[PDB]
Write a protein that binds this ligand. Structure first.
Ligand code: K
Ligand code: RU
Length: 263
């Protein structure tokens, strides 16, 4: 059965010319709204949440892990490295790499997180360990963002990602201290004001992680604390038919606005 909200999301999708995926969990009652909730989308930089969370999980049994230095060499720089480039021929700690990956979307930082986990499959292994059977990370930065239609690499579904983001940020996938650190990092994101945030009432607080890639892929995953309400988790994924398509953060904002108005 197609709800009013799903009908509005379908109308939005029609006029965008791309493919939209949405999953909401309202933790007030544990109910879900889904639009293409079981279709696979390229995660792009939204996958950085899983990598950072996997390192946080490792840190539960190693008190000093987040202070561990990692060498940054000139050859490590990839396509978008606003924090790592300052530390070439130097080091960053795993906390610094996590913060850079999440809050600035530094791709070199993400590669160091992936390497700390033993490669893309180590990120997938963590996903499986916390009950996510859908997520897969197959490649490093920058190629994990190729976002080719039909390609299963580096994809998940909206349903799966919402459930995982809820477990990580509001549930008990991580220890208490670690959960709080993840939430702090997400709430300090610098890249999100044009995406889910832009569709929500001002008073609501958001922590989010964006992503982008080829095929005009434009993504955001968020944990939301509405005014006077239990928290929400919202995934919005969007991808387009041609490789060179422009980003459409406005479509994510429009999806968020529809979800907010349907609560
Ligand atoms: K793009
Ligand atoms: Ru492995």
């Amino acid at each position: 059965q197609t709800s009013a909200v799903q009908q509005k999301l379908a109308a939005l999708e029609k006029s965008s010319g791309g493919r939209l995926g949405v999953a909401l969990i309202d933790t007030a009652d544990n109910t879900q709204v889904l639009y293409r909730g079981d279709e696979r989308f390229p995660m792009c930089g939204t996958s950085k949440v899983m990598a950072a969370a996997a390192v946080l999980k490792q840190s539960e049994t190693q008190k000093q892990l987040l202070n561990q230095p990692v060498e940054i060499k000139p050859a490590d720089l990839v396509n978008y490295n606003p924090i790592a480039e300052k530390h070439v021929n130097g080091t960053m700690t795993l906390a610094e790499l996590s913060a850079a990956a999440l809050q600035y979307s530094d791709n070199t930082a993400m590669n160091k997180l992936i390497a700390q986990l033993g490669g893309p499959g180590g990120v997938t292994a963590f996903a499986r360990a916390i009950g996510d059977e859908t997520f897969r990370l197959d490649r490093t930065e920058p190629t994990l963002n190729t976002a080719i239609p039909g390609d299963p690499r580096d994809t998940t579904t909206p349903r799966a990602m919402a459930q995982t983001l809820r477990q990580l940020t509001l549930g008990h996938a991580l220890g208490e201290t670690q959960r709080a650190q993840l939430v702090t990092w997400l709430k300090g994101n610098t890249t999100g004001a044009a995406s889910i945030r832009a569709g929500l009432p001002t008073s609501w607080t958001v922590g989010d992680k964006t992503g982008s890639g080829d095929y005009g892929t434009t993504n955001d995953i968020a944990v939301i604390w509405p005014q006077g309400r239990a928290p929400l988790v919202l995934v919005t994924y969007f991808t387009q038919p041609q490789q060179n398509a422009e980003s459409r953060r406005d479509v994510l904002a429009s999806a968020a606005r529809i979800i907010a108005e349907g609560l």
